[PDB]
Enzyme design. Structure first.
Site, PDB file in Angstrom:
ATOM      1  N   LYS A   1      38.288  39.677 -22.156  1.00 24.83           N
ATOM      2  CA  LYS A   1      37.291  39.144 -21.196  1.00 24.83           C
ATOM      3  C   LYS A   1      37.281  39.982 -19.916  1.00 24.83           C
ATOM      4  O   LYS A   1      37.441  39.492 -18.799  1.00 24.83           O
ATOM      5  CB  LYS A   1      37.559  37.684 -20.913  1.00 24.83           C
ATOM      6  CG  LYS A   1      37.486  36.812 -22.145  1.00 24.83           C
ATOM      7  CD  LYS A   1      37.375  35.329 -21.851  1.00 24.83           C
ATOM      8  CE  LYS A   1      37.040  34.479 -23.075  1.00 24.83           C
ATOM      9  NZ  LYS A   1      38.007  34.590 -24.156  1.00 24.83           N
TER      10      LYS A   1
ATOM     11  N   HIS B   1      45.129  37.865 -28.130  1.00 22.04           N
ATOM     12  CA  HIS B   1      45.372  37.872 -26.678  1.00 22.04           C
ATOM     13  C   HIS B   1      46.698  38.584 -26.485  1.00 22.04           C
ATOM     14  O   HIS B   1      47.760  37.969 -26.422  1.00 22.04           O
ATOM     15  CB  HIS B   1      45.476  36.455 -26.072  1.00 22.04           C
ATOM     16  CG  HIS B   1      44.179  35.716 -25.944  1.00 22.04           C
ATOM     17  ND1 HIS B   1      43.152  36.161 -25.145  1.00 22.04           N
ATOM     18  CD2 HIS B   1      43.768  34.520 -26.448  1.00 22.04           C
ATOM     19  CE1 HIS B   1      42.168  35.280 -25.167  1.00 22.04           C
ATOM     20  NE2 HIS B   1      42.509  34.274 -25.962  1.00 22.04           N
TER      21      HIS B   1
ATOM     22  N   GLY C   1      41.287  28.904 -33.582  1.00 18.48           N
ATOM     23  CA  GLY C   1      42.682  29.016 -33.146  1.00 18.48           C
ATOM     24  C   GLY C   1      43.497  27.869 -33.707  1.00 18.48           C
ATOM     25  O   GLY C   1      43.883  27.878 -34.869  1.00 18.48           O
TER      26      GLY C   1
ATOM     27  N   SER D   1      41.794  33.238 -34.495  1.00 15.66           N
ATOM     28  CA  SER D   1      42.285  33.391 -33.111  1.00 15.66           C
ATOM     29  C   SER D   1      43.779  33.219 -33.135  1.00 15.66           C
ATOM     30  O   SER D   1      44.295  32.126 -33.158  1.00 15.66           O
ATOM     31  CB  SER D   1      41.609  32.375 -32.211  1.00 15.66           C
ATOM     32  OG  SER D   1      41.868  32.650 -30.847  1.00 15.66           O
TER      33      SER D   1
ATOM     34  N   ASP E   1      46.602  32.962 -31.615  1.00 17.34           N
ATOM     35  CA  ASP E   1      47.076  32.608 -30.290  1.00 17.34           C
ATOM     36  C   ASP E   1      48.526  32.222 -30.285  1.00 17.34           C
ATOM     37  O   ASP E   1      48.870  31.081 -30.062  1.00 17.34           O
ATOM     38  CB  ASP E   1      46.165  31.559 -29.696  1.00 17.34           C
ATOM     39  CG  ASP E   1      44.771  32.088 -29.399  1.00 17.34           C
ATOM     40  OD1 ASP E   1      44.647  33.309 -29.205  1.00 17.34           O
ATOM     41  OD2 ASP E   1      43.805  31.309 -29.318  1.00 17.34           O
TER      42      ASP E   1
ATOM     43  N   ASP F   1      35.448  42.642 -14.240  1.00 21.56           N
ATOM     44  CA  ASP F   1      35.607  43.324 -12.963  1.00 21.56           C
ATOM     45  C   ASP F   1      34.527  44.382 -12.808  1.00 21.56           C
ATOM     46  O   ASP F   1      33.684  44.585 -13.676  1.00 21.56           O
ATOM     47  CB  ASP F   1      37.041  43.901 -12.885  1.00 21.56           C
ATOM     48  CG  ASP F   1      37.647  43.831 -11.507  1.00 21.56           C
ATOM     49  OD1 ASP F   1      36.955  44.126 -10.504  1.00 21.56           O
ATOM     50  OD2 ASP F   1      38.873  43.500 -11.417  1.00 21.56           O
TER      51      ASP F   1
ATOM     52  N   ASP G   1      40.659  39.940 -27.115  1.00 20.96           N
ATOM     53  CA  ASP G   1      39.881  38.995 -26.320  1.00 20.96           C
ATOM     54  C   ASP G   1      40.310  39.039 -24.864  1.00 20.96           C
ATOM     55  O   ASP G   1      40.799  38.072 -24.305  1.00 20.96           O
ATOM     56  CB  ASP G   1      40.077  37.606 -26.929  1.00 20.96           C
ATOM     57  CG  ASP G   1      39.200  36.554 -26.288  1.00 20.96           C
ATOM     58  OD1 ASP G   1      38.302  36.900 -25.510  1.00 20.96           O
ATOM     59  OD2 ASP G   1      39.414  35.352 -26.553  1.00 20.96           O
TER      60      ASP G   1
ATOM     61  N   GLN H   1      38.536  22.251 -23.418  1.00 21.20           N
ATOM     62  CA  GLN H   1      37.978  22.725 -24.673  1.00 21.20           C
ATOM     63  C   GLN H   1      37.215  21.602 -25.348  1.00 21.20           C
ATOM     64  O   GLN H   1      37.605  20.442 -25.289  1.00 21.20           O
ATOM     65  CB  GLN H   1      39.060  23.237 -25.595  1.00 21.20           C
ATOM     66  CG  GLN H   1      38.583  23.746 -26.967  1.00 21.20           C
ATOM     67  CD  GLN H   1      37.737  24.980 -26.873  1.00 21.20           C
ATOM     68  OE1 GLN H   1      36.692  24.966 -26.204  1.00 21.20           O
ATOM     69  NE2 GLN H   1      38.179  26.080 -27.533  1.00 21.20           N
ATOM     70  N   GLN H   2      36.130  21.974 -25.997  1.00 19.84           N
ATOM     71  CA  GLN H   2      35.275  21.081 -26.781  1.00 19.84           C
ATOM     72  C   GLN H   2      35.010  21.683 -28.140  1.00 19.84           C
ATOM     73  O   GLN H   2      34.740  22.868 -28.222  1.00 19.84           O
ATOM     74  CB  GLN H   2      33.948  20.832 -26.075  1.00 19.84           C
ATOM     75  CG  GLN H   2      34.045  20.448 -24.639  1.00 19.84           C
ATOM     76  CD  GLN H   2      32.696  20.273 -23.996  1.00 19.84           C
ATOM     77  OE1 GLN H   2      32.223  19.145 -23.805  1.00 19.84           O
ATOM     78  NE2 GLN H   2      32.078  21.383 -23.622  1.00 19.84           N
TER      79      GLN H   2
HETATM   80  O1  LIG Z   1      33.437  41.635  -6.098  1.00 22.59           O
HETATM   81  C1  LIG Z   1      34.505  42.259  -6.285  1.00 22.59           C
HETATM   82  C2  LIG Z   1      35.748  41.699  -6.640  1.00 22.59           C
HETATM   83  C3  LIG Z   1      36.912  42.494  -6.711  1.00 22.59           C
HETATM   84  O2  LIG Z   1      38.054  41.984  -6.904  1.00 22.59           O
HETATM   85  N1  LIG Z   1      36.823  43.843  -6.535  1.00 22.59           N
HETATM   86  C4  LIG Z   1      38.048  44.666  -6.627  1.00 22.59           C
HETATM   87  O3  LIG Z   1      38.339  45.197  -5.332  1.00 22.59           O
HETATM   88  C5  LIG Z   1      38.739  46.616  -5.442  1.00 22.59           C
HETATM   89  C6  LIG Z   1      37.659  47.473  -4.806  1.00 22.59           C
HETATM   90  O4  LIG Z   1      38.190  48.791  -4.782  1.00 22.59           O
HETATM   91  P1  LIG Z   1      37.425  49.961  -3.977  1.00 22.59           P
HETATM   92  O5  LIG Z   1      37.581  49.669  -2.495  1.00 22.59           O
HETATM   93  O6  LIG Z   1      38.188  51.179  -4.403  1.00 22.59           O
HETATM   94  O7  LIG Z   1      35.981  49.993  -4.424  1.00 22.59           O
HETATM   95  C7  LIG Z   1      38.948  46.850  -6.951  1.00 22.59           C
HETATM   96  O8  LIG Z   1      40.318  46.686  -7.327  1.00 22.59           O
HETATM   97  C8  LIG Z   1      37.993  45.830  -7.589  1.00 22.59           C
HETATM   98  O9  LIG Z   1      38.542  45.485  -8.869  1.00 22.59           O
HETATM   99  C9  LIG Z   1      35.626  44.412  -6.192  1.00 22.59           C
HETATM  100  O10 LIG Z   1      35.504  45.649  -5.952  1.00 22.59           O
HETATM  101  N2  LIG Z   1      34.502  43.621  -6.099  1.00 22.59           N
HETATM  102  O1  LIG Z   2      33.834  29.961 -24.890  1.00 21.27           O
HETATM  103  C1  LIG Z   2      34.936  30.381 -25.307  1.00 21.27           C
HETATM  104  C2  LIG Z   2      35.331  31.730 -25.407  1.00 21.27           C
HETATM  105  C3  LIG Z   2      36.561  32.088 -26.001  1.00 21.27           C
HETATM  106  O2  LIG Z   2      36.870  33.296 -26.211  1.00 21.27           O
HETATM  107  N1  LIG Z   2      37.432  31.115 -26.395  1.00 21.27           N
HETATM  108  C4  LIG Z   2      38.722  31.503 -27.002  1.00 21.27           C
HETATM  109  O3  LIG Z   2      38.716  31.109 -28.376  1.00 21.27           O
HETATM  110  C5  LIG Z   2      40.018  30.510 -28.739  1.00 21.27           C
HETATM  111  C6  LIG Z   2      39.809  29.032 -29.017  1.00 21.27           C
HETATM  112  O4  LIG Z   2      41.048  28.566 -29.533  1.00 21.27           O
HETATM  113  P1  LIG Z   2      41.163  27.084 -30.156  1.00 21.27           P
HETATM  114  O5  LIG Z   2      40.402  27.084 -31.470  1.00 21.27           O
HETATM  115  O6  LIG Z   2      42.643  26.946 -30.354  1.00 21.27           O
HETATM  116  O7  LIG Z   2      40.614  26.092 -29.156  1.00 21.27           O
HETATM  117  C7  LIG Z   2      40.941  30.821 -27.544  1.00 21.27           C
HETATM  118  O8  LIG Z   2      41.703  32.011 -27.761  1.00 21.27           O
HETATM  119  C8  LIG Z   2      39.957  30.907 -26.368  1.00 21.27           C
HETATM  120  O9  LIG Z   2      40.538  31.795 -25.401  1.00 21.27           O
HETATM  121  C9  LIG Z   2      37.073  29.797 -26.305  1.00 21.27           C
HETATM  122  O10 LIG Z   2      37.816  28.859 -26.718  1.00 21.27           O
HETATM  123  N2  LIG Z   2      35.858  29.462 -25.747  1.00 21.27           N
END
Ligand SMILES: O=c1cc(O)n([C@@H]2O[C@H](COP(=O)(O)O)[C@@H](O)[C@H]2O)c(=O)[nH]1
Ligand SMILES: O=c1cc(O)n([C@@H]2O[C@H](COP(=O)(O)O)[C@@H](O)[C@H]2O)c(=O)[nH]1
Lengths: 257, 257
Positions: free
Chosen positions: B92, B61, B228, B35, B37, B95, B90, B208-209
């Protein structure tokens, strides 16, 4: 004992960012957030300028802007100040606290430098909020927690939604409300913003589901509608925004009695 | 009837990206994902070069890189090919489908153009996967679903974890495994990658754990450790990576018998 937006802006426990928002909502008679889901800076800015008077907030997805620069965000801030709306970067932070702090402050986007509001998923536990807070509290920012989602198969239900509410209420120095489909908190200091909104029934091909402003604001008790395609795909985006504004505002008034 | 990584690489239903990964894991005797980071491109690249022989994967990231450019990612790909590891952004994604498709393909980062693997939260429902797939399937990419999290207060438990597993198994043309704390699927075609790993007991200040490689790989049945700070904060990052590699690899062998 439902209070107007203007009165909610004065509540003892109100967050300053929430207060600023509520005040401008009342002043401008708008509870519409534009979801400015475009890929070109010029289009973003032209929408912000034209629609600024009609909206309380402009929601961005900075990571879809093909020609992002920090100068674009400077220009957006100028428009936000001129027309009086907040900037909400819809980043959906959703990592461990140590990671999100860096994603909020740093990188190319420097989100905390220009966004009044951001949001977060609650799935990681409260560390996501604590990490964001480390950056956002000194910068006088606010955060929204995603308590419910509009999309088909959403897992943000039941005990998950309750956990979001508890997390907000426990971090009220930073968290100013929710992304949700309905009122989820009984505390009037928290904002409810609802996406998945169009005037007509329907959805999209990828799990989006729509409900009307009257449904969301009037029946389900939310505060603000977030509207993307219902505005952005229309020929006349200004008229579309005005239709959505009027719908949301009347629904609010009627609920207020 | 546990199979070696090399045999799993040949399973009828294996995804090509999973197969490539499993093959290089077996070849190199590594089930360590670094990772990376860090906030500087030069540091990222120097780590990738030095540690490349010790790792099966480098997790990025991109949004914390202060000096990101697409040319940096070109350089990273060169190292990935030279040393034989996959690149995992990574991000995540979390949406609605229509939004994530744009976040994956577009913007400044153009993630799909350089990342072998990405990941997604399952909270939005399966539209998140469907949206990503629209971009990733044509580009021959893979995706990991976040079934469990390492952080305090994680809500990715119980029925949420089960939903993640079902979603993976229903989208096996694109989804190649999980981010999880343990084996969550009984199907050997899916990869399990586990973060929250250090040799010593502890955590951080922001939820973190940590658990050890022996615990995660040996007792909990995961495939790959994601590390990381246990590496990055060490003085000698190469030696640290080798310690983690040897720990994870032996735990795997012992479980295999
Ligand atoms: O539950 C959720 C949470 C959101 O942020 N959104 C966001 O709101 C917008 C919805 O756009 P639209 O009205 O074109 O469907 C998008 O940018 C989407 O990422 C969503 O549609 N549902
Ligand atoms: O459950 C999760 C999911 C993750 O992606 N991560 C990611 O894994 C890495 C963990 O880093 P570290 O070993 O320094 O704690 C981070 O980049 C974090 O975003 C996490 O720690 N826990």
């Amino acid at each position: 004992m439902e209070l107007s937006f203007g009165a909610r802006a004065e509540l003892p426990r109100i967050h300053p960012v929430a207060s600023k928002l509520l005040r401008l909502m009342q002043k401008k008679e708008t509870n519409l957030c534009l979801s400015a889901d475009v890929s070109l800076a010029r289009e973003l800015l032209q929408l912000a300028d034209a629609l600024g008077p009609s909206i309380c907030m402009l929601k961005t997805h900075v990571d879809i802007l093909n020609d992002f620069t920090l100068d674009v965000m400077k220009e957006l801030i100028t428009l936000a100040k001129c027309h009086e709306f907040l900037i909400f970067e819809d980043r959906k932070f959703a990592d461990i606290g140590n990671t999100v702090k860096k994603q909020y402050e740093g990188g190319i986007f420097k989100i905390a430098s220009w966004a009044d509001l951001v949001n977060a998923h609650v799935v990681p536990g409260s560390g996501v909020v604590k990490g964001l807070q480390e950056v956002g509290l000194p910068l006088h920012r606010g955060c929204l927690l995603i308590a419910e989602m509009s999309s088909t198969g959403s897992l943000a239900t039941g005990d998950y939604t309750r956990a979001a509410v508890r997390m907000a209420e426990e971090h009220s120095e930073f968290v100013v409300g929710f992304i949700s489909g309905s009122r989820v908190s009984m505390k009037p200091e928290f904002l409810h913003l609802t996406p998945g909104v169009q005037l007509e029934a329907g959805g999209d091909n990828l799990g989006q589901q729509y409900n009307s402003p009257q449904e969301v604001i009037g029946k389900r008790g939310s505060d603000i509608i977030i509207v993307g395609r219902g505005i952005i795909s229309a020929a006349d985006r200004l008229e579309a925004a005005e239709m959505y504004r009027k719908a949301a505002w009347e629904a609010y008034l009627s609920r207020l009695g």
